[model samples]
Target: TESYCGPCPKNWICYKNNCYQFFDEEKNWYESQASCMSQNASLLKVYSKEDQDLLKLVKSYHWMGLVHIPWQWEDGSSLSPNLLTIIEMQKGDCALYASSFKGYIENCSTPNTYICMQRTV
Candidate 1:
C-alpha cells in the first residue's frame, strides 16, 4: 500500500500517509503557517487521536492548525471537539499540542514552535 510513497524529505518524519516536519524555530502562529507554506506544507492538522499522538514526544508548546474564531483547521475544516481537548479556549486564540493530548488555546501572536505536514507522494 505504501509502495508508491518514497522516503520523506531530509529531516522530515514519515507517518501513515503523510510527512511531517517539526520546526524548532519559534514564531507566531500566523508566521509559522507562512513558513510552512514556504516549505510546501501547511500547519499540522489533527483530525484524530492518532494525528495528535504523532507530534514530537513533547514540544511543550507548538502551533497546531486549529484556531478558535469558532474553531477550525488550517484548511478551514470545522473542528469536532470529540477529537481533541482545547483548554483556555477563547476569542482569537490559536491551538497548541502538549505531551499527551492536551491542546492549549493562546493568543495568536505569541511565539511558539510549530509542526508542518504534507501528504507523502
Candidate 2:
C-alpha cells in the first residue's frame, strides 16, 4: 500500500496545516455555506492564535463556520469561552470574524463574503 498527502488546491491559502479561501461574492449565510459546501469545504472556523491572526489580515466581513444555537463550530467543536472577544453580539443569529472587529454576530440573511476552510483527509 502507498499513501500520499498533497498540498492545498489552487487559489487556496495554506496556513497552520489547513486550507482556506475567501469567496468575494456576497451571499447570505445559508448561501455562503452552500457555496463552501459546493467546493467540499466549510465556513472557516478559527481555533488558534494562528488561525485568528491569519483571519485578521482580511478586511471584509465574512461568515464564520459557527451557529449560536448551541454555539459550536461546523465540526461540532464547542466555541471557546475565551475565544469570543466581542461582548455585544447577542442580537444576531450568524457569526462573522474580522481583523478590525474580531468576532461579531450578524443577521443570517445579510449578504457578505465568506471564508471557507478545508481539512486534510
Candidate 3:
C-alpha cells in the first residue's frame, strides 16, 4: 500500500492529506481572500469534525471560507452543521472561527487574521 499523505510546503501544516497555513497578519475579508488566492489557495473550509478541530488549534479569531449567503462557503457549497453554530453578530457577510470552535459572522470590512488551505492529491 502507498501513502497518499505527503509533507506540506514551508510554513504549512499537513493533516488528512490537506495543507493549512495561518496568516496572523491583519487583513480585511477581501484582502484575506486575496492573500490566499495569491498563494494558490483559499480560506479554510470546515467540513468534518476533524476539520473543525484542526482549526480550533488556532487561538485567534480567523476567517474561514464561509460566507453569509444565508449560510454558504466560498466554494458555493451550502454550509454544513458540524461541530459549530453560525452566530450572526451584526449582520456580516463573512464567517470566522470563534471561541469554543463556533462560527461567528462579521462585516467583511472588519480586519482579522485568516487561515488558508490547500488540498493534497
Q: Pick the candidate with the highest TM-score.
A: 3
Highest lDDT: give the candidate number. Answer: 3
Model 3 scores what on Cα lDDT?
A: 0.80
Global fold similarity of model 3 (TM-score): 0.85
Candidate 2 regions off by >4 Å? 1-6, 87-90
Candidate lDDT values, in order: 0.78, 0.78, 0.80
Give per-residue CA lDDT, model 3, range 35-117, as digits (tens). 99899888987788764466556676899888876477777887776657878775688888866667888899998999888
Distance (Å) between predicted and true CA of 13, model 1?
Answer: 0.4
- What's the count of clashing pairs in each model shown? 0, 0, 0
List clashing residue pairs in candidate 2.
none
lDDT of 2: 0.78
Stretches of model 3 off by over 4 angstroms after superposition = 1-4
Candidate 1 per-residue C-alpha lDDT over 37-78 given as tens digits, one digit per residue, 9 for 90 to 100: 998889988776764466547657788888777488888888
How does candidate 1 score on lDDT? 0.78
What stretches of model 1 exceed 4 Å from their correct place? 1-7, 89-92
> How do these models rank on TM-score, best leading?
3, 2, 1
